[PDB]
From Swiss-Prot, chain B:
Protein name (record): Neuropilin and tolloid-like protein 2
Description of how the protein assembles with itself and partners: Interacts with GRIK2 and GRIK3, but neither with AMPA-nor with NMDA-sensitive glutamate receptors.
Residue ranges that the Swiss-Prot or TrEMBL entry lists as coiled coil: none
Role, per record: Accessory subunit of neuronal kainate-sensitive glutamate receptors, GRIK2 and GRIK3. Increases kainate-receptor channel activity, slowing the decay kinetics of the receptors, without affecting their expression at the cell surface, and increasing the open probability of the receptor channels. Modulates the agonist sensitivity of kainate receptors. Slows the decay of kainate receptor-mediated excitatory postsynaptic currents (EPSCs), thus directly influencing synaptic transmission.
Subcellular localization, as worded in the UniProt entry: Membrane
Tissue localization of expression: Brain (at protein level).
PTM remark: N-glycosylated.
Taxonomic lineage: Eukaryota, Metazoa, Chordata, Craniata, Vertebrata
Organism whose genome encodes this protein: Rattus norvegicus (Rat)
Transmembrane intervals: 4-24
UniProtKB/Swiss-Prot annotation, chain C:
Originating species: Rattus norvegicus (Rat)
Subunit structure: Homotetramer and heterotetramer with GRIK5. Tetramers may be formed by the dimerization of dimers. Assembles into a kainate-gated homomeric channel that does not bind AMPA. Can form functional heteromeric receptors with GRIK4 and GRIK5. Can form functional heteromeric receptors with GRIK3. Interacts with DLG4. Interacts with NETO2. Interacts (via C-terminus) with KLHL17 (via kelch repeats); the interaction targets GRIK2 for degradation via ubiquitin-proteasome pathway.
UniProt name for this protein: Glutamate receptor ionotropic, kainate 2
Cytoplasmic side: 28-83
Function in brief: Ionotropic glutamate receptor that functions as a cation-permeable ligand-gated ion channel, gated by L-glutamate and the glutamatergic agonist kainic acid. L-glutamate acts as an excitatory neurotransmitter at many synapses in the central nervous system. Binding of the excitatory neurotransmitter L-glutamate induces a conformation change, leading to the opening of the cation channel, and thereby converts the chemical signal to an electrical impulse. The receptor then desensitizes rapidly and enters a transient inactive state, characterized by the presence of bound agonist. Independent of its ionotropic glutamate receptor activity, acts as a thermoreceptor conferring sensitivity to cold temperatures. Functions in dorsal root ganglion neurons.
Extracellular side: 105-253
C-alpha cells in the first residue's frame, strides 16, 4: 500500500461500498433484471434478479480482481455501471504495478557503497582524516589524479574534515555522516571492537612497520633474520589475531541477491492467515445461527 | 534437496505449515466420501 | 525464477495448499451452499455442494495462475476467503512483474566503459601494459594530461600490476579487471581468434611499420613506389585477412 | 576507415629537405604537439548535453 496515498486507500474502499449499494439500487427497480426460474417451463415467477444485497457487494469485490464472477446483469442501465466499474479497476491496477515498479527500480539504482573507494565525485558526505597525520601527507603530492581531488576538498573545508585525533575522528563519524580516512590497522582494530561500526573499502596505500636501530649496528641485520624466521613460521599471524581478535560482528547480507524476499513481502501471508481464521470463526457462527433460526 | 529443505530460518515453521497442509488434505477425502455416500 | 527469491516460492506452495484446503473445509461445512440440481427443479430434495478436491484445488491453481476458474462461491465465508485468495495472488504477481521490470531496466541502463579518459577517471579497473614495450614509455614521456595521469597510476602501482609478458597480462585480463595497453595489431589478432575479448576505444598512437635501409639503398624509392602500388591494390588487406581473420573468422563467435 | 591515405609534403627530386623534414616530423609526432593542435583546429563546438 506504500505506492499509493492511504487517502485513496480508504476512498477506494468506501467507493467499493458506494458502487455496490447503488448497483443494488439500480438492480432492484429494474424490470429487465427479473429472470424466469424454471426457464424451460413457462409456468413460474420472475423472481430471479441475479442480485442480492450479498451479490452487489460480492460482485463489487470480485469484479475488481481480474477473475470476475458469472453474475452479470442483463439490463443496459446495469452494464453501464459495470463498465465504469471495470474501467476504474483497470486504472487502479495499471497504476499500482507501475508505481511499485518505480519504487523498486529506484531502490536498485540506489548504489550504497559511496563508490567504496572514492568519495570523490560525491562531494557531500564530508569525509575526513586525522589532522595533519600521515594520510594528508600522502594526499599531499599524491598525483594519482583521483586521490588528488580528495586532498583538494579536504584542503578547502579544512575546518570540519580535519579532526583532532583518532578518537575524535570516530566520534565525529558517530555524530553525523563523516567518512573517515586513516591507517588500516587501527581501522580494523576499532571496527573489530565497535562491531556495527562499518568497514569501508579495500586498501589505498601500503607502508612499512619494521624495527629502528642505531646506525650501522650489527643488531639490525641479525634481528632481520629473526623477524623473517618468525614470519616464515607463522607466529606472526596468530599473534596478530590474539591482539586483534576482539568481538566478531554478526554477518551481513552482501553477496546474496537483492531479489525480492520475505523481508519485503511477508505481511500479506499473515494477512491471509488472520483473514481466514476470522472467516472460519464467522463461518461456524453463521452455521450455528442458521441452526438457531431452524431450532 | 535434503539440505535445501532442512536448512531454512526455523525450518520448524516449514514443517509446521507442511503438517497443517497434509493433515487438512487428509481431512478432505473423509468429507468427500461422506458426501458421496449422502 | 531469478527475480523472485526461493524464499517465497515454497511460500507460494504452502500458501496455495492452505488456501485451497481451508476454502474447501469452509465451503463443505456450510448450510447455504447446498443447491438444487435440475434446471426446471420443482423444489426437489437433492440439494448438495458441487465442490470436490479437483474443483477447489485448481480453483486455487487458476486464481494463483492469474485466470478466473469456474464454481463461483456463494456463502459469506467461502466468498470472503476466495476474495482473499484473489487479493493475495494479484498482489504477489504484480510485485513479481515489478521486480522483473526492475532488473531488466537497471541492466538496460548500464553503460560499459569505453574511453581511455573514461578509464583515466576510473580507479578500480586496473590499467596495464608490458612495461618497456615502448607503450608505457610513451606514457612516461606523454604530454597529454590524461596520458600523464595514466602514467602516474602506472608508476603508482610501481609494477605491482604491470607485467613483463604479453600473454600473462592477457590471462590477467581474462581473470581480473586489467587493461594491458598494447599495440593494435596483436589486439586485432587475439580478439578475432579469442573468446570474451574486445577491442576498446580508439587508437592513442600512430606508430608505423616500414623497411629499414642504410642511407644508401637503391631499393628505398623503388620500394616506396612498390608499397604504394600494393596498398593502392590492397593485397595487404587480403594478407591481413589471411593471417588475422582467416584464422579470426573461423574462430569468431 | 574504408581506405588509408597519408598527407605528406611535396618537393621535387634531390631535395635535401626530404630527410631533414622526415626527422622533424617524427620528433614533433613524438612531441604530441601535432595531436593537441589537431584537436584545437578540429575542435569546433563540442557535444551539447542531450540525455
Ligand atoms: C551499535 O549498537 C548500539 C547498541 O548498543 C548502538 O548504541 C549504536 O548506536 C549502534 N551503532 C554504532 C555505530 O555503534
Ligand atoms: C566474472 O567476474 C568474476 C569476479 O571475480 C571473475 O572471478 C570471473 O572469472 C569473471 N568471469 C566469469 C565467467 O564469471
Ligand atoms: C570465456 O568465458 C567462458 C565462461 O564465461 C569460458 O568458458 C571460456 O573458456 C572463456 N573463453 C576464453 C577465455 O577465451
Amino acid at each position: 500500500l506504500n505506492p499509493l496515498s492511504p487517502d485513496i486507500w480508504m476512498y477506494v474502499l468506501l467507493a467499493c461500498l458506494g458502487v455496490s449499494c447503488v448497483l443494488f439500487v439500480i438492480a432492484r427497480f429494474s424490470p429487465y433484471e427479473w429472470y424466469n426460474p424454471h426457464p424451460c417451463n413457462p409456468d413460474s415467477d420472475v423472481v430471479e434478479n441475479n442480485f442480492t444485497l450479498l451479490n452487489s457487494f460480492w460482485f463489487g469485490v470480485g469484479a475488481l480482481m481480474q477473475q470476475g464472477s458469472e453474475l452479470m446483469p442483463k439490463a443496459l442501465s446495469t452494464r453501464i455501471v459495470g463498465g465504469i466499474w471495470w474501467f476504474f479497476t483497470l486504472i487502479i491496477i495499471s497504476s499500482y504495478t507501475a508505481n511499485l515498479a518505480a519504487f523498486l527500480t529506484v531502490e536498485r539504482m540506489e548504489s550504497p557503497i559511496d563508490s567504496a573507494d572514492d568519495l570523490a565525485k560525491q562531494t557531500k558526505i564530508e569525509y575526513g582524516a586525522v589532522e595533519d597525520g600521515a594520510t594528508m601527507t600522502f594526499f599531499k603530492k599524491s598525483k594519482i589524479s583521483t586521490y588528488d581531488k580528495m586532498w583538494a576538498f579536504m584542503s578547502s573545508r579544512r575546518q570540519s574534515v580535519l579532526v583532532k585525533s583518532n578518537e575524535e575522528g570516530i566520534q565525529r563519524v558517530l555524530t553525523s555522516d563523516y567518512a573517515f580516512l586513516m591507517e588500516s590497522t587501527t581501522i580494523e582494530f576499532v571496527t573489530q571492537r565497535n562491531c556495527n561500526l562499518t568497514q569501508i573499502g579495500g586498501l589505498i596505500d601500503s607502508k612499512g612497520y619494521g624495527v629502528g636501530t642505531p646506525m650501522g649496528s650489527p643488531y639490525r641485520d641479525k634481528i632481520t633474520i629473526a623477524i623473517l624466521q618468525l614470519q616464515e613460521e607463522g607466529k606472526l599471524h596468530m599473534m596478530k589475531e590474539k591482539w586483534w581478535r576482539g568481538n566478531g560482528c554478526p554477518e551481513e547480507e552482501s553477496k546474496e541477491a537483492s531479489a525480492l524476499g520475505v523481508q519485503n513481502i511477508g505481511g500479506i501471508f499473515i494477512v491471509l492467515a488472520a483473514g481466514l481464521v476470522l472467516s472460519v470463526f464467522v463461518a461456524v457462527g453463521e452455521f450455528l445461527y442458521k441452526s438457531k433460526k431452524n431450532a | 534437496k535434503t539440505h535445501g529443505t532442512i536448512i531454512g530460518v526455523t525450518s520448524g515453521i516449514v514443517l509446521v505449515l507442511l503438517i497443517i497442509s497434509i493433515l487438512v488434505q487428509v481431512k478432505q477425502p473423509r468429507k468427500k466420501v461422506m458426501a458421496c455416500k449422502t
